[PDB]
Amino acid sequence: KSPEALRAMVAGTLANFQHPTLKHNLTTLKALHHVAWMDDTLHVELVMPFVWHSAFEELKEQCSAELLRITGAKAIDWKLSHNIATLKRVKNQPGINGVKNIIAVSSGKGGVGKSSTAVNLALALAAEGAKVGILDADIYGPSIPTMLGAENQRPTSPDGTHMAPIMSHGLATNSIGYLVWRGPMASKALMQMLQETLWPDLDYLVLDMPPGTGDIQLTLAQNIPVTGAVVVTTPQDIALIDAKKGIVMFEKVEVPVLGIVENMSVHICSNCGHHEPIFGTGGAEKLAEKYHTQLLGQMPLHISLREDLDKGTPTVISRPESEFTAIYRQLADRVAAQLYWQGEVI
């Protein structure tokens, strides 16, 4: 078991593992950090530039069979780390202090679950192994502090000018609702809240944007160093048209569109367990390839998800072992990988 021959065997095995989060195989990512041989057990330490906790489990169950087969180990001791990479933005627009990446979440009008996707994406990204925050920028409907229960709280001012973020459910949070308003005036107060908030070491910062593609939304996509955008829609035709507009809006500002999330794809009868595409099917998939982007994931419509939206504890935290949390965790892996595969590391 030569340590250089061990690395060659391990890297030669990980090079075949395929996954929706892997545009190219793992050897592309230089992730193979360490390969050792202690007490007849083969140690493999992997350091990914984006979150990969759930996908890392699939790698273990698929490759350990052959990894034990070519090596001579009683077992394999895996280990997953994360050094989240800061991706370069267009025009080198100065990024936010303490914020590596900014994943924007936008939609067209309400009723699509944009804000529901924002809180759970942020919690899933943190659950997948990153330092995550979330800025509620939805001026029309500041609903993030309510979804987290931090509605009755207010941020403190350590620097007098700067604001200390509310650490809700482990996320560094702040909201425009803590200050309540249309036109360029709303964009200014929303902007400086991003600068004046003392974000910690946020590898990711989910930005719940105001819905629509007006001048105030476009002003946000211009002056905010958005690393990537995630458009949210329902299989309804009226929502897909708005998603078509949002993708166009972000493209015309050179902000990378990570993909589309199809909320309320099907409804799950709480008694029958039957899945009913009450709003259509495949409409989001059609828009994904029509604009050369991915369909990052789908999310059903279920009564338990709406109930979690009223109790002030999002589903990723309330039901950490549910299918819905497992879907949100997959979305985080799918999103953070797409944020990486599109750009270049700094």
Using CB under 8 A, list all residues that contact a second copy.
109-112, 141, 234, 236, 238-239, 241-242, 267, 269-272, 274, 276-280, 301, 303, 306
Alpha-helix residue ranges (DSSP H) falling in 128-236: 144-148, 184-196, 215-223
Cβ proximity to Mg ion, 20 vs 141, nearer residue = 141
Q: Please state the closest distance from residue 109 (CB atom) to a second copy, in A.
A: 4
Question: Residue 267 binds which entry of a second copy, Mg ion, none, with Cβ cut-offs from 5 to 8 Å by kind?
Answer: a second copy
Q: Can you name the residues that pair with 254 across neighbouring β-strands?
A: none
Tell which residue, 20, 17, 31, has the closest CA to residue 59: 17
Is 170 a known ligand-binding residue? no
Cβ proximity to Mg ion, 85 vs 240, nearer residue = 240
Question: Residue 138 binds which entry of a second copy, Mg ion, none, with Cβ cut-offs from 5 to 8 Å by kind?
Answer: Mg ion
Q: Does 141 bind Mg ion (CB under 5 A)?
A: yes
Question: Residue 345 binds which entry of Mg ion, a second copy, none, with Cβ cut-offs from 5 to 8 Å by kind?
Answer: none
Is 113 a known ligand-binding residue? yes
Identify the burial level of 295 via C-beta atoms within 10 angstroms of its C-beta, where 0-12 means exposed, 13-18 middle and 19 or more buried.
middle
Is 115 a known ligand-binding residue? yes
Of positions 13, 101, 107, 115, contacts Mg ion by CB under 5 A: 115
Q: Distance between CA atoms of 276 and 34, rounded to whole angstroms?
A: 48
Is 112 a known ligand-binding residue? yes
Helix axes 237-251, 283-290, angle to 10 degrees: 20
Tell which residue, 22, 33, 30, has the closest CA to residue 58: 22
Cβ proximity to a second copy, 153 vs 236, nearer residue = 236
Cβ proximity to a second copy, 180 vs 346, nearer residue = 180
Query: In terms of DSSP bridges, do strands 228-233 and 166-168 run parallel, antiparallel, or are they unpaired?
Result: unpaired
Q: Distance between CA atoms of 21 and 25, rounded to whole angstroms?
A: 10
Tell which residue, 72, 73, 56, has the closest CA to residue 14: 56
Q: Please state the closest distance from residue 237 (CB atom) to a second copy, in A.
A: 9
Is 283 a known ligand-binding residue? no
Q: What is the dihedral of CA 31, 89, 101, 106, to 10 degrees?
A: -120
Question: Residue 236 binds which entry of Mg ion, a second copy, none, with Cβ cut-offs from 5 to 8 Å by kind?
Answer: a second copy
Count the residues in the chain.
346
The owner of tokens 């780390």 is: 81
Find the part of the chain contacting Mg ion (CB under 5 A) among 108-116, 225-233, 262-270, 307-315: 108-116
Cβ proximity to Mg ion, 143 vs 298, nearer residue = 143
Tell which residue, 216, 293, 267, has the closest CA to residue 113: 267
Question: Residue 303 binds which entry of a second copy, Mg ion, none, with Cβ cut-offs from 5 to 8 Å by kind?
Answer: a second copy
Question: Residue 271 binds which entry of Mg ion, a second copy, none, with Cβ cut-offs from 5 to 8 Å by kind?
Answer: a second copy
Residues 6 or more apart whose Cβ sits within 8 Å of residue 184: 216, 219
Is 206 a known ligand-binding residue? no
Is 266 a known ligand-binding residue? no
Q: Does 138 bind Mg ion (CB under 5 A)?
A: yes
Is 111 a known ligand-binding residue? yes
Cβ proximity to a second copy, 231 vs 335, nearer residue = 231
Query: In terms of DSSP bridges, do strands 275-276 and 257-268 run parallel, antiparallel, or are they unpaired?
Result: antiparallel
Q: State the DSSP H helix or E strand holding residue 88, giving kind and residue range, or none if neither.
A: none
DSSP code of residue 95: P
Q: Does 175 bind Mg ion (CB under 5 A)?
A: no
Give the binding site for Mg ion (CB under 5 A).
Answer: 115, 138, 141, 143
Binding residue ranges: 108-115
Binding residue ranges for ATP: 108-115
